[PDB]
Write a protein that binds this ligand. Sequence first.
Ligand SMILES: O=C(O)[C@@H](O)[C@@H](O)[C@H](O)[C@@H](O)CO
Length: 304
Amino acid sequence: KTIIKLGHYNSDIHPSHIALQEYFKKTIENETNHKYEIRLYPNNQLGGEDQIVNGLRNGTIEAGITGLLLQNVDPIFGVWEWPYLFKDNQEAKKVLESPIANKIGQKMEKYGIKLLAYGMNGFRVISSNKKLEKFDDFKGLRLRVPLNSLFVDWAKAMNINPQSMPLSEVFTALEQKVIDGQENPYMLIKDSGLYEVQKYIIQSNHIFSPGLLQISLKTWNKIPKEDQIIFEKAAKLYQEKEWELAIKTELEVKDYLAKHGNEIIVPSEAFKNDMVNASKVLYDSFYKKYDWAKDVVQKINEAK
Ligand SMILES: O=C(O)[C@@H](O)[C@@H](O)[C@H](O)[C@@H](O)CO
């Protein structure tokens, strides 16, 4: 009997967790005569996101959902979070279901990880103690960013002062007045309780964050193809159901946050355009330092 521990950083009521429970775990456990058990560990129980990545690579954490932190080993994996790459949720899903996304996903095997599905965490918004409604308001702003220099660079391009830290440190950084806010999808902002200590939510949607369902290659190579087909069936069902649930749930969460004291700012056309224009410096740099960037972005655009 094979026990597969599956760790992630989201809440047990995040759509990823619900879909893991109902579709991924159940499909595998039932359709393999209970030969595999998929034990779920939400909310950083098995460690923070970076620890999950490392555990997938060394095999001590057999499965997981993470974002794109493996980009610190090979930057190609971080491409999906480049700013303003996708116009909306449906376009993000369409591109992540395309051949180029599959091909980049396959490259994770070189680093010990088998990718099973691209799911959705969502577009990222800025939460803040300070009202932000025009580009000049970023000056002086101290924002936590994730453990990924892309986000450090993004923040600097916005004239924001970033401080990269693990997600588990955000509450205490706010409480200590070390930062003014952070950025993450709407559902994380609710599920985490960050909304209770962040008056303003600014709907920047600057970056789209996928949640990658992954299995350690060390684990995968012990599973015969007949059984892998069942894991793949479960991952495909997980993916369809998770996108659907995530889109539905995000709309609920947006309404919730409107009605519990938070002030949601939808950027003006000018604020929007200023953010978009400011982000171009990131792409200028990608095209200079990555020999694959021109081709990859072209294929991503062709898949839209
Ligand atoms: O804010 C966080 O901690 C996470 O949203 C990120 O670490 C995200 O999962 C990664 O995709 C960022 O590259």
